[PDB]
Design a protein around this ligand. Structure first.
Ligand SMILES: [Br-]
Ligand SMILES: [Br-]
Ligand SMILES: [Cl-]
Ligand SMILES: [Hg+2]
Lengths: 175, 174
C-alpha cells in the first residue's frame, strides 16, 4: 500500500517535472560538481530533488542518497544513484536514476524575462554591441575566463565548441 | 590661344586635368541643376571656374551662354555652353553634355519597421552600428555584397557611390 508513502519530486531548470525521478537517465559533464539532490546536467540545466510526506501532503519530507558512487572525472562511465525519502511515521520511498558522464559542459542562457540575449565584442577594453543574439534557452560553450570592463563581467561563448569559445569574441553579460 | 581665358573644373574637390569641353556628365532626374555648380548622379560636386589665361590664375568671369537643361525626364540629354571673358575682353567657350539619368540610388524598405538597422563588418564579425535609416530613404549601394553567417549585407552611403565602397555602414541585403 503506497498512498501514505513519501513522494519524491524533481525540478529541471526551475520547472516541476511530472515524470517519476525513478528510472530517469541524466547526462552530466566531465569535471562537474555533482550532488545527488542538486546538480547540473551537460546542458547546464539545474536539477533539484526533494520530497514530501505523501502524494496528498506537501509538508517537507527528509530525503538522502543511500547510494551515490558518482565520479565525474572520466567520460563514458555511468553510475546509478539511489535516493530514499522517509516520512514522519517512518514510511519510505526510494527512487533510482542513472547518470551518464559526458565530455562537455554547455550552459543554458536565460534571458530572465526577455526572449532575446544581447552579445558583445571586445577590442582592447572597448565593448561593442554585436549583431549576434541568442534566444532564452539556447545552449552554448563558455570559456572558463571571464573579463570585467567598466565593472561589468562578460563571458565568452560559442555554440560550436569550448575551444572556439576561448577566442570567439562573442560575449554575454555574466550571470 | 595662350592669351585667352582658361576654363577649369573640379570634381569632388579635386582639380581636373582634362578639358571641360567635350565632357559628358550624368545628372539625376529631378535634381537642381546649375551649369557652374551641380551634383552628378553619383553625388560628386562639379564646380566650374575660369582664369584670365594659361599663365594667369587671376579670376576670370564665366557664365552659361546656353543652358537648356531640364531634369524632369530621364533619357534626355542637353548641351551646355559656357563662355569665359578676360579683362582685355578675350573669350573662351566650352561645351559639355548632360545626360538625365534615373536615380543611381536605391530605396531602403523597412518591411514593417519605420527604422532600418545598420552594421559594421570587421573580418567575419558583424557589429551593430549606431547609424539608422528611415523606410523610403535613398542611398548609394556598393556593387560588392558580403555574406557572413549565410546572411548577405550591402555597403551603403547617403553621400556618394564612391563613399559606399568604404563607409563600413552595411544593411541586410533585400
Ligand atoms: Br539530462
Ligand atoms: Br558624371
Ligand atoms: Cl543587435
Ligand atoms: Hg548589437
Amino acid at each position: 500500500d503506497t498512498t501514505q508513502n513519501p513522494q519524491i519530486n524533481w525540478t529541471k531548470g526551475g520547472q516541476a517535472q511530472s515524470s517519476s525521478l525513478n528510472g530517469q537517465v541524466f547526462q552530466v559533464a566531465v569535471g562537474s560538481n555533482f550532488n545527488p539532490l542538486n546538480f547540473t546536467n551537460s546542458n547546464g540545466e539545474n536539477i533539484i530533488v526533494s520530497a514530501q510526506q505523501s502524494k496528498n501532503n506537501t509538508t517537507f519530507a527528509s530525503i538522502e542518497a543511500t547510494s551515490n558512487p558518482v565520479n565525474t572525472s572520466e567520460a563514458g562511465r555511468y553510475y546509478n544513484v539511489t535516493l530514499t525519502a522517509t516520512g514522519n511515521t517512518g514510511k519510505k520511498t526510494t527512487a533510482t536514476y542513472t547518470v551518464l558522464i559526458t565530455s562537455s559542459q554547455k550552459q543554458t542562457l536565460y534571458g530572465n524575462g526577455e526572449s532575446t540575449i544581447s552579445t558583445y565584442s571586445i577590442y582592447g577594453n572597448n565593448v561593442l554591441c554585436n549583431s549576434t543574439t541568442f534566444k532564452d534557452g539556447d545552449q552554448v560553450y563558455v570559456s572558463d575566463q571571464t573579463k570585467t570592463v567598466g565593472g561589468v563581467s562578460y563571458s565568452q561563448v560559442s555554440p560550436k565548441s569550448k575551444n572556439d569559445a576561448n577566442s570567439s569574441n562573442i560575449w554575454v553579460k555574466t550571470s
